[PDB]
C-alpha cells in the first residue's frame, strides 16, 4: 500500500512547549495528508487537511507543513487539552492508509528517563 511512518512513537513535553511530529510517506503523495487528534476513549478528530489547512475552529497552535515524503505537525504551545494520540492519513490512493501514531504526554515522575 502506501506505508506511513510516525516519528516518534511517544513523547513527554511540558505546558507551554513547542512540539513536533514527523509523518513520512512511501510513495510521493503530493500533499494529500490529514492529521488527527485522539484523546483516550475518543473518536479521532480532524486537525489539519491538505498538509496545511486547519479544519474549522481548530486553534492556530496546531500547524502542518510538508509535501511529498516528509510531513511535520507542530504545537507551538502545550495545553493539557492536547493530551492525545496523533495520526497522519494519506489520500493519494486506496487503501487509504493511516500511520502508527504519536502519543503525546505530560512530563510526570519518571527520571525523564535520562540516565
Amino acid at each position: 500500500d502506501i506505508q506511513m511512518t510516525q516519528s516518534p512513537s511517544s513523547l513527554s513535553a511540558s505546558v507551554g512547549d513547542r512540539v513536533t511530529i514527523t509523518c513520512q510517506a512511501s510513495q510521493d503523495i503530493s500533499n494529500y495528508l490529514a492529521w488527527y487528534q485522539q484523546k483516550p476513549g475518543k473518536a479521532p478528530e480532524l486537525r489539519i487537511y491538505d498538509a496545511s489547512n486547519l479544519e474549522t475552529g481548530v486553534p492556530s497552535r496546531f500547524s502542518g507543513s510538508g509535501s511529498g515524503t516528509d510531513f511535520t505537525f507542530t504545537i507551538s504551545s502545550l495545553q493539557p487539552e492536547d493530551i492525545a494520540t496523533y495520526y497522519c492519513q494519506q489520500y493519494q490512493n486506496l487503501p487509504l492508509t493511516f500511520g502508527p501514531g504519536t502519543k503525546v504526554d505530560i512530563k510526570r515522575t519518571v527520571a525523564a528517563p535520562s540516565v
Partner: protein
Amino acid sequence: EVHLLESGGNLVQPGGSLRLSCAASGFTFNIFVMSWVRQAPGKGLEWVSGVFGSGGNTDYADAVKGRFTITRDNSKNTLYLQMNSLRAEDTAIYYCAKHRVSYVLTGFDSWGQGTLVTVSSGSASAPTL
C-alpha cells in the same frame, strides 16, 4: 451538525457474523462518501470499506474482502456493515466516518463514537506441546 450514531457491535464467536449500523445527521447524507474504519487493541487505524453516494461503487481492504459487505440505506440515512467469517484479527472498535468531501480520496471530516467487536471464543486451545 454531523451526528454519527453506531449500534450493533457485540461479542461474537469465530465464524460468526455481525451487522453493524451507523446512522447519520445534519448533512446531506446521500451526497457524501461513507467509510468504516476500525481500530485494533494495540494497533492504529485501518480503513475497511468505502461506499459511494448512490450505494454505487464500494471498495474494501484486502483483509476484509469477501467477508464484509457494505450497504447504505439512503431513505433512513444509515450505513451497514455485514461482517461474515469473523476471525480474531477482526476484533476492534469500529467507527463510521464521513468523508470531508464527496469522494473516496478524502480525509474524514466527522467520526462516530465506536462500537466494539470482540470476535473471541476463548483465546486458543492447543494441548499437544
